[PDB]
Structure formats: structure tokens, C-alpha cells
Amino acid sequence: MPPNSRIFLVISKYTPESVLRERFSPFGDIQDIWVVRDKHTKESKGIAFVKFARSSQACRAMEEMHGQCLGPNDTKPIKVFIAQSRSHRDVEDEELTRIFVMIPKSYTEEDLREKFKVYGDIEYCSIIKNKVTGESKGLGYVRYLKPSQAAQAIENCDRSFRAILAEPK
Numbered sequence: 001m002p003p004n005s006r007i008f009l010v011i012s013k014y015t016p017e018s019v020l021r022e023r024f025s026p027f028g029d030i031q032d033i034w035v036v037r038d039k040h041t042k043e044s045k046g047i048a049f050v051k052f053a054r055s056s057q058a059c060r061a062m063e064e065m066h067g068q069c070l071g072p073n074d075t076k077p078i079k080v081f082i083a084q085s086r087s088h089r090d091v092e093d094e095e096l097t098r099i100f101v102m103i104p105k106s107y108t109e110e111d112l113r114e115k116f117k118v119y120g121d122i123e124y125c126s127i128i129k130n131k132v133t134g135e136s137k138g139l140g141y142v143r144y145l146k147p148s149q150a151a152q153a154i155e156n157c158d159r160s161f162r163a164i165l166a167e168p169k
Helices: 017-027 055-065 109-119 149-157
Strands: 006-010 030-037 044-052 079-082 098-102 120-128 136-144
Touching: 006 055, 006 098, 017 044, 044 055, 044 120, 055 079, 055 136, 055 149, 098 149, 109 120, 109 136, 109 149
Parallel strands: none
Antiparallel strands: 006 044, 006 079, 030 044, 098 136, 120 136
16 A cells, blocks of 8 residues: 555446446456445535555546546546645645655756656756765656656666655755
């Protein structure tokens, strides 16, 4: 259950778990499907959660299923977001596209770009440089276009890079 691998859905209250399963299984390994219902009336509240094995699967499902219709009888389109674990119910895409990496100090900006462009569209790319010596601090930032690309980078690149999403201090 890696971070950012659970999605939150706003769906029709007549949408069962089976529809969600058959429509979201192609994106990856589903570990849980939870349509929120009233504990006393057992009636769906029109919200759902789907848990994937990898954050890239959840991000792709969110990017490809947001705005779709889950049934001709089910009327209005659904909304899909990345569910946040901490105490709105959704993460913002700005918090999902930029990764922080540890690079060898010999990496130029072009080295980082060539090593990380294989995971998606690099929107911005920079390396933290020691102002005094003018040399790299061994730290880099890569902001992609889609959250799925950042997740693919995080879970596919070498473990020496210690790739992780950027986050406030």
C-alpha cells in the first residue's frame, strides 16, 4: 500500500462495486473497492475508494477515468482524484508531479534530464548547486506533466536516487 495509491471517486449512487471493478481493473492490481454506504440504510452515498498496488496505477486510473460515464443509465460523469491519507478528500495534481532525487555530484542538468526523461514529459528540471564552490550538492528536482509519470519515475528508477515526491517541510 504505497503512498498515493488509493483513489477517491464521486460516482452515481446506483453504481455497484462490480462496475468499478470491471472499469478500473485494466489499470493495475486492485486491493480494495469500497463504496461508502449508510451503516443503517445500506444505501450508497455516491462516493467510493479504490486501492491499487502502485501509485502509478492509481494515477493512470485517475488521469484516464475522470469525467467518464460508468453507465448509460447512470447519468452524470464521475470524478476521480488521488485520496489523501492525512486528515478536502483529494490531493492536488501540483503535489504529485515534482520529485526530489539524490544524484551524483558529477551530473549536469542534462545528465539528470536524460536519466529521467524516460518516465514522462519533463516540464522542469534543476539541480541544487553550492553557491560558494559552484558545484552540485548532489540534489535534484524533476517536475513532470502527469502524476503517473512522477510515480513511474519514483517506482522504476535506481534505488540510489532515493526518488520521492517533493513535500513541504
